[PDB]
Enzyme design. Structure first.
Site, PDB file in Angstrom:
ATOM      1  N   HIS A  14       0.828  -1.205   0.000  1.00  0.00           N
ATOM      2  CA  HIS A  14       0.000   0.000   0.000  1.00  0.00           C
ATOM      3  C   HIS A  14       0.866   1.260   0.000  1.00  0.00           C
ATOM      4  O   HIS A  14       0.594   2.197  -0.736  1.00  0.00           O
ATOM      5  CB  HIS A  14      -0.969   0.040   1.183  1.00  0.00           C
ATOM      6  CG  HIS A  14      -1.806  -1.187   1.333  1.00  0.00           C
ATOM      7  ND1 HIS A  14      -2.403  -1.526   2.523  1.00  0.00           N
ATOM      8  CD2 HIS A  14      -2.152  -2.151   0.452  1.00  0.00           C
ATOM      9  CE1 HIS A  14      -3.071  -2.654   2.371  1.00  0.00           C
ATOM     10  NE2 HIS A  14      -2.935  -3.053   1.122  1.00  0.00           N
ATOM     11  N   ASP A 112      -6.524   4.180   1.744  1.00  0.00           N
ATOM     12  CA  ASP A 112      -6.511   3.013   0.853  1.00  0.00           C
ATOM     13  C   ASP A 112      -7.640   2.076   1.181  1.00  0.00           C
ATOM     14  O   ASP A 112      -8.503   2.420   1.967  1.00  0.00           O
ATOM     15  CB  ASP A 112      -5.133   2.291   0.766  1.00  0.00           C
ATOM     16  CG  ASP A 112      -4.675   1.736   2.095  1.00  0.00           C
ATOM     17  OD1 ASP A 112      -5.504   1.201   2.888  1.00  0.00           O
ATOM     18  OD2 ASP A 112      -3.466   1.831   2.308  1.00  0.00           O
TER      19      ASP A 112
HETATM   20  O1  LIG Z   1      11.954  -8.684  -2.527  1.00  0.00           O
HETATM   21  C1  LIG Z   1      11.159  -7.789  -2.812  1.00  0.00           C
HETATM   22  C2  LIG Z   1       9.787  -7.986  -2.709  1.00  0.00           C
HETATM   23  C3  LIG Z   1       8.932  -6.921  -3.029  1.00  0.00           C
HETATM   24  N1  LIG Z   1       9.479  -5.662  -3.471  1.00  0.00           N
HETATM   25  C4  LIG Z   1       8.577  -4.553  -3.846  1.00  0.00           C
HETATM   26  O2  LIG Z   1       7.546  -4.575  -2.894  1.00  0.00           O
HETATM   27  C5  LIG Z   1       6.258  -4.316  -3.603  1.00  0.00           C
HETATM   28  C6  LIG Z   1       5.500  -5.618  -3.559  1.00  0.00           C
HETATM   29  O3  LIG Z   1       4.140  -5.355  -3.710  1.00  0.00           O
HETATM   30  P1  LIG Z   1       3.164  -6.426  -4.336  1.00  0.00           P
HETATM   31  O4  LIG Z   1       1.856  -5.758  -4.610  1.00  0.00           O
HETATM   32  O5  LIG Z   1       3.780  -7.236  -5.430  1.00  0.00           O
HETATM   33  O6  LIG Z   1       3.040  -7.549  -3.117  1.00  0.00           O
HETATM   34  P2  LIG Z   1       2.559  -7.427  -1.515  1.00  0.00           P
HETATM   35  O7  LIG Z   1       3.182  -6.316  -0.857  1.00  0.00           O
HETATM   36  O8  LIG Z   1       2.699  -8.802  -0.978  1.00  0.00           O
HETATM   37  O9  LIG Z   1       1.056  -7.100  -1.813  1.00  0.00           O
HETATM   38  C7  LIG Z   1      -0.058  -6.742  -0.923  1.00  0.00           C
HETATM   39  O10 LIG Z   1      -0.676  -5.565  -1.416  1.00  0.00           O
HETATM   40  C8  LIG Z   1      -0.988  -5.589  -2.896  1.00  0.00           C
HETATM   41  C9  LIG Z   1      -1.589  -4.233  -3.244  1.00  0.00           C
HETATM   42  O11 LIG Z   1      -2.899  -4.167  -2.604  1.00  0.00           O
HETATM   43  C10 LIG Z   1      -1.889  -6.804  -3.216  1.00  0.00           C
HETATM   44  O12 LIG Z   1      -2.199  -6.939  -4.629  1.00  0.00           O
HETATM   45  C11 LIG Z   1      -1.330  -8.107  -2.594  1.00  0.00           C
HETATM   46  O13 LIG Z   1      -2.251  -9.192  -2.673  1.00  0.00           O
HETATM   47  C12 LIG Z   1      -1.067  -7.882  -1.111  1.00  0.00           C
HETATM   48  F1  LIG Z   1      -0.555  -9.080  -0.626  1.00  0.00           F
HETATM   49  C13 LIG Z   1       6.548  -4.109  -5.075  1.00  0.00           C
HETATM   50  O14 LIG Z   1       6.734  -2.707  -5.349  1.00  0.00           O
HETATM   51  C14 LIG Z   1       7.912  -4.855  -5.189  1.00  0.00           C
HETATM   52  O15 LIG Z   1       8.745  -4.261  -6.195  1.00  0.00           O
HETATM   53  C15 LIG Z   1      10.861  -5.468  -3.590  1.00  0.00           C
HETATM   54  O16 LIG Z   1      11.382  -4.414  -3.996  1.00  0.00           O
HETATM   55  N2  LIG Z   1      11.685  -6.538  -3.257  1.00  0.00           N
HETATM   56  O1  LIG Z   2      -3.311  -5.062   0.016  1.00  0.00           O
HETATM   57  C1  LIG Z   2      -4.305  -5.970   0.155  1.00  0.00           C
HETATM   58  C2  LIG Z   2      -5.304  -5.978  -0.800  1.00  0.00           C
HETATM   59  C3  LIG Z   2      -6.311  -6.913  -0.686  1.00  0.00           C
HETATM   60 CL1  LIG Z   2      -7.613  -6.914  -1.890  1.00  0.00          CL
HETATM   61  C4  LIG Z   2      -6.338  -7.795   0.367  1.00  0.00           C
HETATM   62 CL2  LIG Z   2      -7.622  -9.007   0.552  1.00  0.00          CL
HETATM   63  C5  LIG Z   2      -5.362  -7.812   1.352  1.00  0.00           C
HETATM   64  C6  LIG Z   2      -4.348  -6.895   1.211  1.00  0.00           C
HETATM   65 CL3  LIG Z   2      -3.160  -6.967   2.513  1.00  0.00          CL
END
Ligand SMILES: O=c1ccn([C@@H]2O[C@H](COP(=O)(O)OP(=O)(O)O[C@H]3O[C@H](CO)[C@@H](O)[C@H](O)[C@H]3F)[C@@H](O)[C@H]2O)c(=O)[nH]1
Ligand SMILES: Oc1cc(Cl)c(Cl)cc1Cl
Length: 462
Positions: A14, A112
């Site tokens: 986020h 968000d």
């Molecule tokens: O080793 C690493 C690992 C990551 N990064 C960076 O961290 C960010 C990862 O975000 P991403 O949306 O892919 O995964 P995450 O944070 O698990 O997502 C949550 O939030 C997302 C947005 O709501 C959602 O879609 C998801 O389901 C959630 F789980 C992205 O900008 C990568 O480039 C990095 O630089 N090095």
């Molecule tokens: O960034 C997010 C977006 C959504 Cl849609 C879920 Cl379910 C959970 C996390 Cl942590």
């Protein structure tokens, strides 16, 4: 100039797109931004660094940590992160009092997807509330429909025998709805539902996606509807990977064009022991070059959302066999730089939307390996509708075995299978450029919002 206050809910997924969104507001639209950061403990680490080195037009206020010590340690992440915003309202009000004193009452409060209770503070201060939505228009549609879905459907969603297929959206089976919808008795669902019921209070919803990526879902969202806020696709807002970083990027410099499979499971994703083992064996079996960001295994897929050496979990001889062709890095890699590197040819991802957009922007085709949150919904979108991801086949027990890992990796990196997705990502890379031009559809949508903010500020001050 308008002052925009941004209140993220916890999670690097986020904060990162919100920082990119803020940079565009200040650089392209001449606004000022203050991040107000809620947390259940002291800020990290990665939080301070992502908020570091920003134009002086962007400030950060870290709130005192809220007390969530009353919660079970088994509390789901979505509960934790929603409550973190909710319980920070008292502290957020004090910040808005300082803004009033400094002659800088915000023109908008941008939350968000899980921070809608902050709307209480926006309403008290007569500040327009907005949502920045960091995931897909498909999943946005789901959130907007959830109040009706909840009302009309009385089983757990996994019991639905027909997939949900909202206007313009890829069908999704009830069993594949996002993780916090999977147990309606859990507070994770109550906080999910509560947040969605507040979406109609938003003055607008800015979504990190773009027209060519999700044309049907976007068209449907923009159609007038009952209590439906205006929806503005403003993406892809990503770190384009041009910032200065090391060892893994040095290794990458020495690999042939398009030859390396990047493997990463987001900011918080992990695999089970059994799956970590099969993945390792399959990667080695595949004989493809790979750069794997590795975390220690867990039965909880998002256990590092917010210790041991992950390398101690790898099978016998694995690091030896892959010593030249594979680079395993614990915990974290400079992902933006990796995806933008000429030697990268593919991305095995958990389907986190920021990782997906980064990959789109660099034209890197995907293997869709969803783990938690809405990733399964994203995987179905990416594989069956957008068609820019391949999916591995999981056995009836849910394990993706080494044979399938090697099949899908080779399929992506060199096979006929991977040609379709590689071509599709090429087209999306181009469209990602198109939409962010001065008169691209994402720039136009963001501009309209910034124009609305400027006009609001104008009318207030006069
Ligand atoms: O080793 C690493 C690992 C990551 N990064 C960076 O961290 C960010 C990862 O975000 P991403 O949306 O892919 O995964 P995450 O944070 O698990 O997502 C949550 O939030 C997302 C947005 O709501 C959602 O879609 C998801 O389901 C959630 F789980 C992205 O900008 C990568 O480039 C990095 O630089 N090095
Ligand atoms: O960034 C997010 C977006 C959504 Cl849609 C879920 Cl379910 C959970 C996390 Cl942590």
């Amino acid at each position: 100039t308008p002052h925009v206050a941004i209140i993220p809910s916890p999670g690097m997924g986020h904060l990162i797109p919100l920082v990119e969104f803020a940079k565009r507001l200040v650089h392209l639209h001449g606004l000022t931004v203050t991040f107000v950061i809620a947390g259940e403990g002291p800020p990290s680490k990665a939080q301070r660094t992502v908020l570091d080195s920003l134009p002086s037009s962007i400030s950060s206020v870290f709130l005192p940590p809220v007390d969530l010590t009353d919660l079970s340690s088994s509390t789901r992440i979505e509960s934790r992160i929603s409550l973190t915003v909710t319980r920070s309202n008292p502290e957020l009000r004090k910040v808005f009092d300082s803004f009033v004193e400094g002659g800088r009452l915000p023109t908008a409060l941008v939350v968000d997807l899980f921070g809608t209770d902050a709307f209480d503070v926006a309403v008290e201060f007569h500040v327009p509330p907005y949502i920045f939505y960091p995931t897909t228009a498909n999943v946005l549609s789901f959130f907007l429909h959830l109040p009706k879905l909840d009302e009309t459907v009385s089983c757990e969603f996994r019991e639905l025998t027909e997939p949900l297929m909202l206007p313009g959206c890829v069908p999704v089976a009830g069993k594949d709805f996002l993780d916090p919808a999977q147990d309606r008795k859990d507070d994770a669902y109550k906080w999910l539902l509560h947040n969605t019921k507040r979406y109609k209070e938003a003055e607008g919803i800015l979504v990190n996606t773009f027209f060519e990526l999700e044309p049907n879902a976007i068209k449907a969202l923009q159609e007038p509807g009952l209590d439906k806020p205006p929806v503005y696709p403003v993406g892809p807002l990503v770190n384009i990977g041009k910032q200065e970083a090391s060892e893994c990027l040095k290794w990458l410099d020495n690999q042939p064009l398009g030859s390396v499979l990047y493997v990463s499971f987001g900011s918080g994703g992990t695999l089970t022991c059994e799956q970590l083992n099969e993945l390792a064996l399959g990667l080695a079996d595949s004989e493809q070059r790979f750069l794997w960001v590795i975390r220690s295994p867990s039965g909880i897929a998002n256990s590092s959302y917010f210790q041991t050496d992950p390398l101690t979990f790898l099978p016998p001889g694995f690091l030896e066999r892959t010593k030249k062709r594979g680079f395993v890095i614990p915990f974290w890699a400079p992902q933006a730089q990796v995806l933008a590197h000429p030697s990268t040819g593919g991305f095995l991802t958990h389907c986190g939307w920021n990782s997906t957009l980064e990959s789109v922007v660099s034209g890197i085709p995907l293997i869709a390996w969803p783990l938690y949150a809405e990733q399964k919904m994203n995987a179905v979108l990416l594989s069956e509708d957008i068609r820019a991801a391949l999916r591995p086949r999981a056995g009836d027990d849910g394990l993706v075995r080494r044979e399938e890992v090697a099949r899908v990796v080779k399929g992506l990196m060199e096979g006929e299978e991977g040609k379709g997705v590689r071509n599709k990502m090429k087209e999306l890379k181009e469209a990602a450029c198109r939409v962010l031009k001065d008169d691209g559809t994402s720039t136009k949508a963001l501009s309209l919002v910034a124009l609305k903010w400027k006009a609001h500020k104008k009318e207030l001050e006069q």
